[PDB]
Ligand SMILES: O=C(O)c1ccc2c(c1)nc(Nc1cccc(Cl)c1)c1ccncc12
Ligand SMILES: O=C(O)c1ccc2c(c1)nc(Nc1cccc(Cl)c1)c1ccncc12
Ligand SMILES: [Mg+2]
Ligand SMILES: [Mg+2]
């Protein structure tokens with residue numbers, strides 16, 4: 001089993017990694033083994049003097065604080081978003097564009113971005129007067145919580161993977177990680193996409209053909225959109241992966257709708273298992289959210305993302321075909 | 325005691341209320357007695373059907389969560405900002421511009437806006453890796469906490485002063501209160517003032533007198549700047565009031581600087597008791613922050629803020645005269 005898992009992890013640089021199989025082969029530690037593999041691939045342990053035992057201890061603790069009984073927003077999703085961000089970071093149009101600290105921030109942000117997710121939405125937490133919504137004044141409730149937990153866990157025994165960064169490196173990384181995870185709040189999607197469109201329309205490219213990003217605002221905007229794309233990457237994956245992700249988010253949505261029904265609240269969209277259309281919901285999600293985002297990302301890094309966009313368009317055609 | 329208490333309460337509608345006397349005559353409950361008196365003057369217990377005993381129970385509970393060993397950001401300051409907001413709400417150029425709910429939101433926001441303040445700044449909390457900064461991801465750390473405490477205390481026994489608001493009224497009040505208190509973060513001052521200035525250059529007014537605000541964005545922005553003005557109203561008050569407030573904020577600042585010194589941190593501006601110029605700092609505070617804010621406000625409600633602006637200019641005159 002160790003051999004086959006190592007074989008599977010050789011695909012860490014590929015879109016379409018068998019992340020559910022890696023979850024199985026790793027003993028439900030996809031986030032730990034995928035993060036560790038990526039950190040070794042990018043030489044991040046040597047670059048930031050991260051003790052390997054500290055890295056594993058933090059990663060296992062972080063993975064533990066994802067909920068194993070949440071169908072979608074769990075450690076497999078976190079590992080998926082981490083690996084997808086890792087691939088997007090390697091795209092040729094971004095070669096040598098980001099520093100080692102920005103790469104570390106984007107990967108760390110992806111790892112923590114949904115930690116301790118309870119499997120219900122921000123609006124559900126707000127409408128039920130949850131403790132979380134009271135703590136965070138109804139504003140990016142979950143995303144603020146994911147950040148707070150992700151950073152707090154660094155203070156557990158032998159968990160401070162950033163112990164050997166300088167003070168300015170720690171300060172800069174913390175700000176970047178916060179800016180990235182707050183951007184995963186879906187209520188910010190339209191604004192994030194509008195800014196990504198503006199950047200594509202005004203794109204500048206250096207003499208070496210890579211993206212020119214000469215200020216923090218543009219650099220962090222690209223990283224925010226990158227992790228957002230990774231978060232919304234399920235419909236761009238091979239269909240056997242996409243359908244499993246769809247099964248899982250529908251189970252989470254239906255369980256939220258069951259709670260909304262039991263409480264006498266209006267049922268959130270796609271959350272009523274009695275009047276649901278899973279296939280129409282996926283086509284509309286692709287048409288109105290995922291394809292607009294990925295077509296814009298593909299424009300930013302053209303032609304690097306052509307195969308990903310082609311898979312997305314094929315999957316939309318397939319889900320559409322199941323409707324008539 | 326209670327009848328001398330009453331005659332000074334008589335001028336709750338006047339700039340320059342004797343709040344320190346009121347704090348002494350009330351047994352250190354100025355927030356409770358001033359809030360109660362204001363709700364009667366504006367008929368808020370009747371319009372919103374608030375039980376008078378629940379108003380008092382929550383007010384004493386809220387007042388208790390202000391720190392008695394914090395020289396400035398305590399219950400006396402909270403009572404002063406309440407009373408100043410209450411007066412600014414009667415500006416002629418703003419006669420009933422705001423509905424009864426918006427009036428309630430501005431006054432409630434004023435009461436809770438610094439609750440549980442520890443006497444140190446957001447930057448101190450961030451740079452010391454405090455639990456509060458960890459919870460709130462370095463963003464409006466204190467102001468988010470003030471809100472969360474102020475709302476959580478409503479869930480104590482016989483404290484839900486909003487129990488008889490409709491569910492939509494409770495949701496609308498909550499949103500406005502959050503929008504207002506978050507705007508008291510001094511890091512947002514320039515953005516709030518620039519928008520007040522833009523409103524000035526786009527000011528639409530009647531011939532009858534009043535300002536004309538149609539959309540929620542313009543409206544909440546005036547109330548944000550209103551409570552901001554009340555928060556920064558000390559230098560516009562009669563001089564013997566202003567001088568007492570200055571003694572208290574300098575004591576609080578010096579105690580923070582003593583902590584930045586003993587921890588080896590960079591001492592915040594005005595916090596080094598061995599290198600302080602209290603009078604120069606007041607003149608600078610007025611010149612760069614308080615007067616530009618209050619003169620922009622004065623223009624928006626021209627000319628009802630003329631006397632407040634005059635008194636500020638007089639106090640800047642006097643503080644300047646104390647520099648040799
Ligand atoms: O936040 C997540 O993790 C999250 C995760 C999954 C979905 C989502 C948000 N939002 C969806 N829809 C959506 C959301 C906002 C606006 C509009 Cl028009 C549509 C959606 C649809 C279909 N399948 C999965 C999702
Ligand atoms: O936040 C409060 O409660 C608060 C309370 C009092 C002061 C303050 C903020 N900020 C001051 N100065 C300041 C603050 C920000 C930027 C710049 Cl240039 C200056 C200041 C100066 C003098 N006296 C009292 C204060
Ligand atoms: Mg999320
Ligand atoms: Mg404050």
Ligand SMILES: [Zn+2]
Pocket residue numbers: 077081113114231
């Ligand atoms: Zn996610």
Ligand SMILES: [Zn+2]
Pocket residue numbers: 401405437438555
């Ligand atoms: Zn204040």
